[PDB]
Amino acid sequence: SGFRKMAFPSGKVEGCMVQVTCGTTTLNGLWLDDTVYCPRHVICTAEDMLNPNYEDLLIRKSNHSFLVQAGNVQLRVIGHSMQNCLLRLKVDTSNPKTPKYKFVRIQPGQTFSVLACYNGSPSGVYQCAMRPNHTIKGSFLNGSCGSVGFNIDYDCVSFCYMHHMELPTGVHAGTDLEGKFYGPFVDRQTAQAAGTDTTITLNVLAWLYAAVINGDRWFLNRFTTTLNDFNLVAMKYNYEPLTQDHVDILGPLSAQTGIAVLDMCAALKELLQNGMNGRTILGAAALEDEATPFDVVRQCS
Amino acid sequence: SGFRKMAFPSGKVEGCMVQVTCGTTTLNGLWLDDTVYCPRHVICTAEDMLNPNYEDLLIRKSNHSFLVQAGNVQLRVIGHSMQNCLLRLKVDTSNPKTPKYKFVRIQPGQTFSVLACYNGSPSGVYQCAMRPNHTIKGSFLNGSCGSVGFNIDYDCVSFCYMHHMELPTGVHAGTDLEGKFYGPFVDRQTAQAAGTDTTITLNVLAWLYAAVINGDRWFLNRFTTTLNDFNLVAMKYNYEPLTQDHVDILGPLSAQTGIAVLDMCAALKELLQNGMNGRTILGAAALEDEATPFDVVRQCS
């Protein structure tokens, strides 16, 4: 069988999605327990965004400037505060659907599912990876702000992303659930631009092991290599350096297939140096880097 | 923004997933209202599968040979019948989570989301397309049988696939929710093999329009072509013939981008004849064919 980049089932999260309107600005928020979290820029107008000041904009606001609707049944807000780039809106009702959850900050390379929402209304679910340049390559249209990203850990939903904006290149940027941005982005409309990305070596290797485990084994190779030698190649092809840690993470996968990590590197080096020859690995004409070792293992014994 | 192949939010469907055990065989079933549907081969043993007879195997069965568990809380079955390759197990309890739903038979080329499940326990969600050869290219491991496929139509869940088996090539096969297989497959373990696939022209074209709408416009072209001429190319590259109907479906997309359908065909012909030159459309090194015109439109105005 294998391998599809799947997202987690979005049910536990759909139930925590609500809408938040501040005058003329509408976007999604996350309703957990008695609190609703959302991007602080729901306070701004397209004017405000050309360099806003949120301390200013928010002191001019009361708990009744915010309309919150869990479905049709509106909630009443009874507090508010500003946690970095987020708004914590205390509210009268506790969310019944509130699942076991926590907030984690996700590292670059790691993946999560995104629940695209509009007006508090889940539209679609997909999986992506936090880019090295701290952006995600997503599909977000207007009013998608406040859509969240998450993994699931048994019964417990770990929230790790909330959507704030689109960058000029069409790639997306956001924050963890404490309102700290990923990357050097600020929630102001300036000339900020994505730093230059790099391909996630660790993930590409894990994917190659997903292929091997699935009979697409043609790219294989008798050669080996030292990580120093491979890393010179990586450099020329804008791949992240491989480290001993990356090698260790990949231990279990090389075990179950019996192909040493350094052998797959040898093989990858050739794929990079020699190209692919319109051949396909797992039905792909290019090396996939949005699947982690843990994603592959969970889906391939 | 755009474009990601997203699946629908799997919440409405997670709640209808239950486990079904028949002696030593376990797999997933669909609990809607007072009925639970599941693959009929839950009746068989790896022995039985080398050419089984289900009329036989099922008359030797009673309503208490089937253990059904909605979570922990077990259901009691109080009927049973065989609808083509499916089992309809009447049960004492009606599913509270039962959403507005219906059963549709999906056409080749069209797409849907899959909720991969094991022991009545949703594992991941993804989107795929019904292949021309009537298989889906999925990720299904043992005990995933009974996992269903569906689209959502406002509030109403249209079910269209239920998983039955893996074919020798690692591609998957199943039935609609009336138990009729897609394709010439039977639920017996024989030498049956996937017919030869073909690339879904209509979908590749819709994808190119998704690219255009997103500034990856480099593959464009001043030439045009007649569908006859294009179809000779399609033939040589194992793409489905383009028909006037396909052209019509693509009308809205060519409108909103202003590029005539036959112009994109001209452009595609070149992509096929000249290759891609390691350049990327929407960040892909090969032409994607699992996104329909309707998928693209829903995600790109």
Short mmCIF file of N, CA and C in Angstrom, two decimals, chain A residues 15-20 30-36 63-64 66-78 89-96:
data_model
loop_
_atom_site.label_atom_id
_atom_site.label_comp_id
_atom_site.label_asym_id
_atom_site.label_seq_id
_atom_site.Cartn_x
_atom_site.Cartn_y
_atom_site.Cartn_z
N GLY A 15 -15.25 21.41 15.66
CA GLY A 15 -16.12 21.81 16.76
C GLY A 15 -15.64 23.00 17.59
N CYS A 16 -14.36 23.34 17.47
CA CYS A 16 -13.83 24.50 18.17
C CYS A 16 -13.74 25.73 17.28
N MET A 17 -14.19 25.62 16.03
CA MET A 17 -14.15 26.77 15.14
C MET A 17 -15.39 27.64 15.29
N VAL A 18 -15.13 28.95 15.40
CA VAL A 18 -16.15 29.97 15.57
C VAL A 18 -15.75 31.19 14.74
N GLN A 19 -16.71 32.08 14.48
CA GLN A 19 -16.48 33.32 13.74
C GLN A 19 -16.31 34.51 14.67
N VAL A 20 -15.54 35.49 14.23
CA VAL A 20 -15.27 36.67 15.04
C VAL A 20 -15.30 37.90 14.15
N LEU A 30 -10.55 30.37 17.50
CA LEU A 30 -10.50 29.05 18.10
C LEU A 30 -11.14 29.08 19.47
N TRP A 31 -12.27 28.39 19.60
CA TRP A 31 -13.00 28.38 20.85
C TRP A 31 -12.73 27.12 21.67
N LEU A 32 -11.85 27.28 22.65
CA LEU A 32 -11.52 26.22 23.60
C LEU A 32 -11.89 26.66 25.02
N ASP A 33 -12.63 25.80 25.73
CA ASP A 33 -13.13 26.12 27.07
C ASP A 33 -13.89 27.44 27.01
N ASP A 34 -13.54 28.34 27.93
CA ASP A 34 -14.19 29.64 28.04
C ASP A 34 -13.47 30.78 27.30
N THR A 35 -12.52 30.44 26.43
CA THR A 35 -11.69 31.42 25.73
C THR A 35 -11.78 31.25 24.22
N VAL A 36 -11.71 32.35 23.47
CA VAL A 36 -11.66 32.26 22.02
C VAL A 36 -10.41 32.96 21.50
N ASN A 63 -15.55 44.80 25.11
CA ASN A 63 -16.06 43.45 24.95
C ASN A 63 -17.28 43.33 24.05
N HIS A 64 -17.91 44.44 23.71
CA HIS A 64 -19.08 44.36 22.83
C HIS A 64 -18.78 44.82 21.41
N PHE A 66 -16.77 43.01 19.73
CA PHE A 66 -16.49 41.68 19.15
C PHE A 66 -17.74 40.80 19.08
N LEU A 67 -18.18 40.47 17.88
CA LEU A 67 -19.26 39.49 17.73
C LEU A 67 -18.73 38.08 17.47
N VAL A 68 -19.12 37.16 18.35
CA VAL A 68 -18.64 35.79 18.32
C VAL A 68 -19.82 34.84 18.10
N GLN A 69 -19.77 34.00 17.06
CA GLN A 69 -20.87 33.09 16.77
C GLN A 69 -20.44 31.64 16.64
N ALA A 70 -20.77 30.83 17.64
CA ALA A 70 -20.59 29.39 17.55
C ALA A 70 -21.76 28.75 16.79
N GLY A 71 -21.64 28.69 15.47
CA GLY A 71 -22.76 28.30 14.63
C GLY A 71 -23.64 29.51 14.46
N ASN A 72 -24.94 29.34 14.66
CA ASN A 72 -25.84 30.49 14.73
C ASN A 72 -25.76 31.09 16.13
N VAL A 73 -25.86 30.21 17.13
CA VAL A 73 -25.92 30.60 18.53
C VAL A 73 -24.73 31.44 18.97
N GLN A 74 -24.93 32.75 19.01
CA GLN A 74 -23.89 33.71 19.35
C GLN A 74 -23.38 33.58 20.77
N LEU A 75 -22.08 33.76 20.95
CA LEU A 75 -21.52 33.85 22.29
C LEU A 75 -21.39 35.31 22.68
N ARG A 76 -21.38 35.55 23.98
CA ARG A 76 -21.16 36.90 24.49
C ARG A 76 -19.77 36.96 25.11
N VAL A 77 -18.97 37.92 24.67
CA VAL A 77 -17.63 38.09 25.23
C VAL A 77 -17.62 38.96 26.49
N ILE A 78 -16.81 38.54 27.46
CA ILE A 78 -16.83 39.11 28.80
C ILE A 78 -15.41 39.39 29.29
N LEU A 89 -10.17 36.24 23.94
CA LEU A 89 -11.48 36.80 24.25
C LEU A 89 -12.23 35.93 25.24
N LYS A 90 -12.16 36.25 26.53
CA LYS A 90 -12.93 35.48 27.50
C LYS A 90 -14.40 35.57 27.14
N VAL A 91 -15.13 34.49 27.36
CA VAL A 91 -16.53 34.43 26.95
C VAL A 91 -17.38 33.71 27.98
N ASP A 92 -18.69 33.98 27.93
CA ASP A 92 -19.65 33.47 28.93
C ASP A 92 -19.82 31.94 28.95
N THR A 93 -19.75 31.32 27.77
CA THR A 93 -19.97 29.88 27.63
C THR A 93 -18.65 29.11 27.48
N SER A 94 -18.58 27.93 28.09
CA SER A 94 -17.45 27.03 27.87
C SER A 94 -17.79 26.10 26.69
N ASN A 95 -16.83 25.86 25.79
CA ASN A 95 -17.10 24.98 24.64
C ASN A 95 -17.28 23.54 25.06
N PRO A 96 -18.48 23.01 24.82
CA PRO A 96 -18.80 21.62 25.15
C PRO A 96 -17.91 20.64 24.36
#
